[PDB]
């Protein structure tokens, strides 16, 4: 490189080549008077934004004109300007002819500058006659022009040789130029005048001539080419200052043009490729005493050695420069710098550099010297096409070991902060909600209202209101609503009355809707209304009526339900009433209010009449008064929580309404209610932590975006000032990616780098125990530009892929793992090493892993050790002490890297371990501790040979049995103690991705939690007992245990499924269906064997004495029920009303149901089509479309659907058909279907005004799934349907 306020490459092109130089004949002389239309010199110049001509490009000739452009009068129009020229030519060409016969001298050589001046004459209308003689060039266009002495002085005036005037202009300025910024400049050219040189034979004559020849003008000249002569350029009184604001003298417009010509000519530089002079650039010989190294004429001068050395701009050069980027070109030249080229003119001599790529030095013969001492160190290199970027991108960032101030850092940050603004806040989570749906379960253990757990008193608190309005800003999502009440509905619709054997819900059954709400959205009824009117919403049977209430609702009754009013009975009720209430004291009022509201619900409701009411409030006094008089009154009853943002609002269903019940409240569902709370404290504890949505961000924010502008910064040497700047701005990151834009404004281009801060990026700034510095050579090497960007809190909306969630899971288990004065061994650790950003520096870790890691640990406030050897590689262990061990995400690789099987490699690691001293190790292992289950679309996993393989990650690992790893653990140390770590039933990983800024996506989430279970993080510590374990963990199978010399006092507390299973001390509330633990009289042991109602993880904790201090042994699981499904489906089927029954028999624990998969979306089949019954028969109409349709049948006895067994019914699809029993008749799909009688189609079903056959019966209601699809009677006969 940067030289004043100009920074340019120290790479550049020299070309070699030039072009030879060619004569002029008088044939040239009569096909340029010719001015052929195929090749017309003139060229028409556009504004460059318009395209519009402004302009006219000027060659040869009239180049003699040098007239007022008032006397000219060219005619405004282009194509006019031309006809009038193309007349003029054709009547000189007449008269050229006469004058001299072409015949006589077809090509010989005529005066150029005598040419000249008579189309000067010609334009002007002049008489040339006299100089018509003159203008065949006889021997010697100077020696001619010398013997001519006719004209006026000012016409053309030589003094000898030497003759001073201007010659032709290099482009027209047309009417239509304004002086535009997209207007290309002229530089003057346009000017009809705008200088006098003199022109001579020869240089050192012509000094002699301007020994005391005025050189105020000056003279600067390109030496490389004599146009018709050396000739002499002086500066004119006129001057410039048309480019805004600069003011220029016309011998600086003239350099800054050729000066750009040449730096152009170095960018486009071709091998092969002839310039048109070796030396493009006017140099001054006269003037010297009026010319200041200060001036931007001096500096021109500079920069046309640089470009004779092939200099080339750091900046991007465009083709043409515009007007205005010429302008700020000017304007970064003026920014004044020392100037890197140590060039400094001499008028002894033109300087040419010894090592200069170009040949020009060869080509000049005079005035020009090269000096041998004079070599300049830079490489020559000219880049490919520099085109503009939009958006900053991400570049990558090497640290450097040397130290620095941390106030300095502080202070350059303060000199380039863009802090700070507004940025949109964007939406921390999107997507569908999770909704927690439960009903009455007699085998569950009855629970008391005392049971329940209170609602939280911060729940009314105005502080946690506003944050929760936060997440629901954050949160991005559809009605909440109007889906609730879709899915609400499908649920109610899938209720069955077990005693009848028949669903409790009876289609057409009288409808109540509660308050619905037509809101100021103007929508003027509830939206989930709408479609089910218009039979729009899935697994809906047709309504016989429906009741609309509600002030809000133009089609509801317009009352609020506030006080008892007169109303209808209808069997169904669905309460959706505007709630209102006066206070939270006022809730215990509001909670009578409810009470209120349920027998307002009841007189409505219907006798055996069931009624929906959201549990908008959940107050344990609410429990225990619907306990006391309403759980005799509905036969049965569900609760439903559908959560889009955290809140405990709750969903009250109940069945069989005016039908006594014994119905109360359940162990599960107590349980469920616990997890209800527990996540809700868990979401609103996230949300507490939530930062501002949309807020003006002044970098206050822990985590916040980071992003800086740097404009025309120098990196030829150290800047410092830039260095320390990016220093800072990467401890802020703390390794974030990083986008930087560079873009031009106020005359100069501004580079933007674009990150966000957080806090765990700045625990690992906390954790620098000196500011380091970094090199940029790599930003040296960056030369391109990129456009200004508007700021977003969020930095993309994509989310984590299920790997990087399960990366995310292990790493927070890691950090809760993370415990005090512990130090650490990681196994499989990136070059990023991330963890020992989470890790705190008080406690020593290690990181290994075969590939070498990319980070610098100079900056480090406290050791940390990292060790270049395979993660599997072995003997360092043996010269290494050892406390504690990790090995994540790395087993699974180990095994492949070294090709062993899953036990073979856990036995390696067996002897690893002999090597390890860790009393506490934790290994993440692919154990299938629940049977294989393979997740469609991330993972394989085959039975054959044990192993993973992930197509989402394409990649296979092989898995190996628990059991037989767990002796080798006993074995290894006999006080080993091994616990199955839980990450599921936590979202605090997923809360680390929030502290990312990540939103997390259940599906991904569930998918991953899968994996874990079949590839858990193995926790094991060489300090534990032993404990006697001859039972079975299944499911109804008995686990035998013994506690050996253990006492009465001592009580044992055991937690499963993330509840306290059972305590030593009150078995009798114990929550285990069977508890046996009984100290042994005669030894103290207590053994344990207990009957499991169901399968899971068991908490193993130790416990002795009345103070009991809870220490936790390896945790167990529990196995599931078997997926195992026998269906015995008849030979010969019924077609008739009564149907066909298929035998199925299953695992007691898993309930089935089939849903018809639509469109690729599960929807269960029409519920009168299918009933189920006992074996287990679930009677299904026989369809003519089920040949067509695919069905299968999936558990259903949880939320989660199929994941233990989805059966397609495949016999069902391709059932054979009987001619003369008649089957009923459905369309397969919605698209139109051609039916086919015997090979002669009876007809097109869903053809666009079909009329059904009269003889033809239609089903009064459709066997179809979809009630629109139908349902037809017909006669004997063959049938087949084609879709059309």
């Known amino acids: 490189a940067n030289?004043?306020?100009?920074?340019?490459?120290?790479?550049?092109?020299?070309?070699?080549?030039?072009?030879?130089?060619?004569?002029?004949?008088?044939?040239?002389?009569?096909?340029?008077?010719?001015?052929?239309?195929?090749?017309?010199?003139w060229k028409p110049?556009?504004?460059?934004?318009?395209?519009?001509?402004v302009a006219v490009q000027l060659f040869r000739p009239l180049q003699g004109l040098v007239l007022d452009t008032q006397l000219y009068g060219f005619p405004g129009a282009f194509d006019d300007w031309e006809r009038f020229m193309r007349e003029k030519l054709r009547v000189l060409k007449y008269e050229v002819l006469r004058i001299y016969p072409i015949s006589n001298y077809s090509n010989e050589h005529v005066n150029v500058f005598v040419a000249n001046a008579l189309v000067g004459a010609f334009l002007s209308n002049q008489a040339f006659y006299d100089l018509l003689p003159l203008l065949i060039i006889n021997d010697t266009m100077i020696g001619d022009l010398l013997g001519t002495g006719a004209s006026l002085s000012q016409f053309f005036q030589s003094h000898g040789d030497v003759l001073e005037v201007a010659a032709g202009r290099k482009y027209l300025q047309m009417e239509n130029y304004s002086n535009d910024d997209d207007d290309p400049p002229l530089f003057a050219k346009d000017l009809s005048d705008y200088a006098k040189a003199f022109y001579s034979d020869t240089y050192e004559v012509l000094d002699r001539?301007?020994?005391?020849?005025?050189?105020?003008?000056?003279?600067?000249?390109?030496?490389?080419?004599?146009?018709?002569?050396?000739?002499?350029?002086?500066?004119?009184?006129?001057?410039?200052?048309?480019?805004?604001?600069?003011?220029?003298?016309?011998?600086?417009?003239?350099?800054?043009?050729?000066?750009?010509?040449?730096?152009?000519?170095?960018?486009?530089a071709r091998p092969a490729q002839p310039v048109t002079r070796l030396d493009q650039c006017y140099h001054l010989r006269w003037g010297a005493q009026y010319v200041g190294e200060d001036s931007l004429t001096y500096r021109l001068g500079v920069l046309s050695l640089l470009a004779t050395n092939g200099y080339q701009l750091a900046r991007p050069i465009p083709r043409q420069l515009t007007n205005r980027w010429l302008s700020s070109f000017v304007s970064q030249i003026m920014s004044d710098g020392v100037n890197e080229t140590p060039l400094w003119p001499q008028e002894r001599y033109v300087q040419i550099a010894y090592d200069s790529p170009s040949v020009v030095d060869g080509a000049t013969q005079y005035g020009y010297v090269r000096k041998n001492q004079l070599r300049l160190g830079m490489r020559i290199s000219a880049l490919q096409s520099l085109s503009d970027t939009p958006s900053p991108v991400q570049w990558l960032p090497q640290y450097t070991i040397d130290q620095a101030a941390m106030d300095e850092g502080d202070l350059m940050v303060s000199r380039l902060t863009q802090l700070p603004l507004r940025p949109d806040y964007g939406n921390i989570w999107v997507g569908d909600a999770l909704s927690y749906y439960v009903d009455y379960n007699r085998s569950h253990r009855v629970v008391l209202s005392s049971e329940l757990p209170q609602l939280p008193d911060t729940y009314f608190d105005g502080d946690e209101q506003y944050g929760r309005s936060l997440f629901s800003l954050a949160r991005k999502i559809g009605d909440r609503s109007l889906v609730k009440d879709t899915a609400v509905l499908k649920h109610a619709y899938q209720a069955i009355d077990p005693n009848?054997?028949?669903?409790?819900?009876?289609?057409?059954?009288?409808?109540?809707?509660?308050?619905?709400?037509?809101?100021?959205?103007?929508?003027?009824?509830?939206?989930?209304?709408?479609?089910?009117?218009?039979g729009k919403i899935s697994g809906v049977p047709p309504p016989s009526s429906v009741r609309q209430f509600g002030y809000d609702v133009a089609r509801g009754a317009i009352v609020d339900l506030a006080r008892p009013f007169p109303s209808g009975d209808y069997q169904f009720v669905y309460s959706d009433v505007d709630q209102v209430v006066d206070g939270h004291d006022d809730l215990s009022i509001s909670s009578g209010l409810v009470e209120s509201l349920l027998s307002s619900c009841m007189h409505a409701t219907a006798p055996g009449g069931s009624f929906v009411v959201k549990i908008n409030f959940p107050t344990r006094p609410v429990w225990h008064y619907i306990e006391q008089k309403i759980l005799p009154n509905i036969t049965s009853y569900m609760l439903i929580k559908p959560f889009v943002t955290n809140n405990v609002e709750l969903f009250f269903v109940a069945f069989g309404v005016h039908q006594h019940s014994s119905l109360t409240w359940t162990s599960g569902v107590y349980f469920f209610l616990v997890d209800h709370f527990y996540r809700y404290e868990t979401l609103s504890t996230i949300s507490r932590q939530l930062p501002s949505f949309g807020y003006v961000d002044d970098g206050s924010s822990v985590t916040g975006i980071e992003t800086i502008s740097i404009e025309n910064p120098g990196f030829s040497n150290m800047t410092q000032a830039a260095r320390?700047?990016?220093?800072?701005?990467?401890?802020?990151v703390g390794n974030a990616r990083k986008s930087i834009a560079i873009y031009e404004s106020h005359g100069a281009r501004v580079l933007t780098i674009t990150s966000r801060r957080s806090p765990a990026s700045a625990r690992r700034k906390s954790r620098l125990r000196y500011l380091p510095l970094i090199d940029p050579r790599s930003l040296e090497v960056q030369a391109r530009t990129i456009l200004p960007a508007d700021p977003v809190l969020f930095e993309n909306v994509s989310g984590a892929s299920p790997h990087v969630c399960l990366t995310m899971m292990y790493n927070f288990e890691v950090s809760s793992a993370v415990y005090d004065g512990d130090v650490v061994l990681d196994l499989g650790t990136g070059p990023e090493a991330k963890i020992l950003e989470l890790i705190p520096a008080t406690s020593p870790v290690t990181c290994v892993d075969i590939r070498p890691t990319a980070q610098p640990s100079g900056c480090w406030n406290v050791r940390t050790t990292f060790l270049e050897l395979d993660y599997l590689s072995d003997g360092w262990i043996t010269g290494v002490r050892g406390d504690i061990v990790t090995c994540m995400l790395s087993l699974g690789a180990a095994a492949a890297g070294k090709s062993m099987t899953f036990d073979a490699a856990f036995q390696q690691l067996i002897k690893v371990l002999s090597k390890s001293t860790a009393n506490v190790v934790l290994v993440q292992v692919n154990c299938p501790t629940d049977v294989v289950r393979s997740i469609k679309g991330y993972l394989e996993i085959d039975s054959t040979?044990?192993?993973?393989?992930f197509p989402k990650f394409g990649r296979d690992e092989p898995y190996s049995d628990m059991d037989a790893l767990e002796k080798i653990c006993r074995t290894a140390w006999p006080n080993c103690s091994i616990t199955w770590v839980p990450l599921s039933y936590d979202l605090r990983w997923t809360r680390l991705a929030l502290l990312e800024s990540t939103t997390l996506s259940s599906a991904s989430i569930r998918i991953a939690e899968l994996m874990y279970k079949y590839m858990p993080i193995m926790r094991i510590d060489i300090h534990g007992l032993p404990m006697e374990k001859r039972g079975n963990f299944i499911v109804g199978q008995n686990c035998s245990l013994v506690i050996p010399g253990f006492?009465?006092?001592?009580?044992?507390?055991?937690?499963?499924?993330?509840?306290?299973?059972?305590?030593?001390?009150?078995?009798?509330?114990?929550?285990?269906?069977?508890?046996?633990?009984?100290?042994?009289?005669?030894?103290?042991?207590?053994?344990?064997?207990?009957?499991?109602?169901?399968?899971?993880?068991?908490?193993?904790?130790?416990?002795?004495?009345?103070?009991?201090?809870?220490?936790?042994?390896?945790?167990?699981?529990?196995?599931?029920?078997?997926?195992?499904?026998?269906?015995?489906?008849?030979?010969?089927?019924?077609?008739?009303?009564?149907?066909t029954d298929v035998d199925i028999t299953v695992n007691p624990y898993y309930r089935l149901m089939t849903f018809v998969r639509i469109d690729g979306q599960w929807q269960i089949a029409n519920p009168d089509k299918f009933q189920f019954f006992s074996t287990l028969v679930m009677n299904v109409k026989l369809d003519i479309a089920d040949k067509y349709l695919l069905y299968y049948i999936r558990d259903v006895q949880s939320r989660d659907v199929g994941f233990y067994i989805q059966h397609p019914l495949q016999l069902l699809n391709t059932i054979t058909?009987?001619?003369?029993?008649?089957?009923?008749?459905?369309?397969?799909?919605?698209?139109?279907?051609?039916?086919?009688?015997?090979?002669?189609?009876?007809?097109?079903?869903?053809?666009?005004?079909?009329?059904?056959?009269?003889?033809?019966?239609?089903l009064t209601d459709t066997i179809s799934w979809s009630p629109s699809i139908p349902t037809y009677i017909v006669p004997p006969g063959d049938y087949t349907l084609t879709p059309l």
């Open 3 to 41: 030289v004043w306020g100009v920074r340019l490459a120290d790479s550049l092109s020299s070309p070699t080549i030039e072009t030879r130089t060619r004569q002029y004949t008088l044939h040239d002389l009569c096909s340029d008077l010719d001015a052929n239309p195929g090749r017309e010199p």
């Open 45 to 53: 110049l556009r504004n460059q934004r318009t395209n519009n001509i």
């Open 209 to 268: 001539f301007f020994w005391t020849h005025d050189s105020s003008a000056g003279v600067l000249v390109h030496y490389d080419k004599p146009t018709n002569g050396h000739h002499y350029l002086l500066g004119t009184l006129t001057q410039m200052v048309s480019a805004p604001p600069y003011i220029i003298n016309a011998t600086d417009a003239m350099l800054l043009e050729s000066c750009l010509e040449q730096f152009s000519a170095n960018v486009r």
């Open 500 to 534: 009848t054997g028949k669903e409790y819900l009876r289609s057409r059954q009288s409808v109540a809707y509660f308050g619905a709400s037509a809101g100021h959205s103007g929508a003027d009824q509830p939206l989930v209304i709408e479609p089910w009117i218009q």
């Open 724 to 732: 320390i700047g990016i220093s800072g701005l990467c401890a802020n």
């Open 945 to 949: 040979n044990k192993r993973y393989r």
């Open 1047 to 1139: 006492n009465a006092q001592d009580v044992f507390n055991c937690y499963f499924n993330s509840a306290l299973a059972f305590s030593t001390e009150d078995v009798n509330a114990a929550m285990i269906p069977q508890v046996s633990a009984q100290f042994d009289a005669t030894k103290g042991e207590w053994t344990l064997d207990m009957v499991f109602s169901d399968a899971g993880i068991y908490t193993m904790q130790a416990l002795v004495g009345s103070n009991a201090n809870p220490v936790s042994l390896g945790s167990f699981v529990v196995d599931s029920p078997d997926v195992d499904i026998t269906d015995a489906w008849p030979a010969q089927l019924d077609f008739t009303i009564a149907g």
């Open 1217 to 1258: 058909l009987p001619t003369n029993e008649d089957l009923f008749l459905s369309a397969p799909d919605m698209r139109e279907w051609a039916v086919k009688e015997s090979g002669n189609t009876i007809c097109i079903l869903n053809s666009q005004g079909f009329v059904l056959p009269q003889d033809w019966d239609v």
